[PDB]
């Protein structure tokens, strides 16, 4: 198909041009699909964070991210929502196989990033797993899947031990938590996660706090970025 969905995206995306951060309360006064307003809604999302508002709209014309705001401030849909539309604007399906990669710092983190996106996302037609560790087993499963949530060193052992695995579509790059991930120790591991991907990617970094390291790998990981940092 299909040819009614092309003129919807094509007349969401007239309207990114016209984005206005001082304009915008609701994820409703975003462009979003009617799917992913239909999922905010149902979830009780409805009027957005500030770092939600400043970063979204970004992400949407295409973007590269690195948003800094402190814990309880909303980054996890400042990331999903743009998710979710990258996909839908390319009628993306299970078949279309990897498009999105989120990688969250622990195994706990990943999973409660993986619920707010099953929640969110559930009237979109795409497929989402979640990959953290605690083994064959997982690799049966993801070779079909669009969105990955996974921790950096099971993403880079499914990389290096799968012959089947490859992101050669991928869409986006996500870094949720990113300076957790690198106070971890893992940004050798991630340079190495990187060098697996396309560079023609979409990268949003999101991070609780202003350190050196994100910053840093704000330079190994994007292109031109759009800094936003919110406060108080
Ligand atoms: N737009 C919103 N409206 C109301 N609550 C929200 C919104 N966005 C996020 N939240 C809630 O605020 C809390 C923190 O969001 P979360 O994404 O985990 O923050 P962060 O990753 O920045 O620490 C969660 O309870 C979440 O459901
Ligand atoms: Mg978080």
């Not at 619920?115 to 605690?134: P, T």
């Not at 979409?202 to 790998?217: R, Y």
Request: net charge neutral; proline share 3%.
């Amino acid at each position: 198909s299909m040819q009614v969905e092309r003129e919807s995206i094509s007349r969401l995306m007239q309207n990114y041009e016209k984005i206005n951060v001082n304009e915008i309360t609701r994820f409703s006064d975003f462009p979003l699909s009617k799917k992913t307003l239909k999922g905010l809604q149902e979830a009780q999302y409805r009027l957005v964070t500030e770092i939600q508002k400043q970063t979204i709209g970004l992400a949407l014309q295409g973007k590269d991210v690195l948003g800094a705001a402190k814990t309880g401030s909303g980054k996890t849909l400042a990331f999903l929502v743009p998710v979710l539309e990258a996909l839908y604007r390319l009628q993306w399906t299970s078949t279309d196989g990897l498009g999105v990669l989120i990688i969250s710092p622990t195994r706990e983190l990943a999973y409660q990033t993986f619920e707010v996106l099953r929640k969110v996302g559930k009237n979109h037609d795409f497929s989402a797993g979640l990959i953290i560790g605690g083994l064959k087993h997982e690799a049966e499963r993801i070779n079909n899947i669009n969105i990955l949530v996974c921790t950096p060193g099971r993403l880079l052992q499914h990389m290096d031990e799968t012959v089947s695995f490859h992101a050669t579509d991928l869409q986006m790059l996500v870094l949720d938590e990113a300076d957790r991930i690198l106070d971890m120790g893992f940004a050798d591991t991630m340079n190495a996660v990187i060098e697996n991907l396309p560079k023609k990617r979409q990268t949003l970094l999101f991070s609780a706090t202003q350190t050196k390291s994100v910053k840093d790998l704000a330079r190994l990981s994007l292109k031109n970025p759009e800094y936003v940092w919110v406060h108080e």
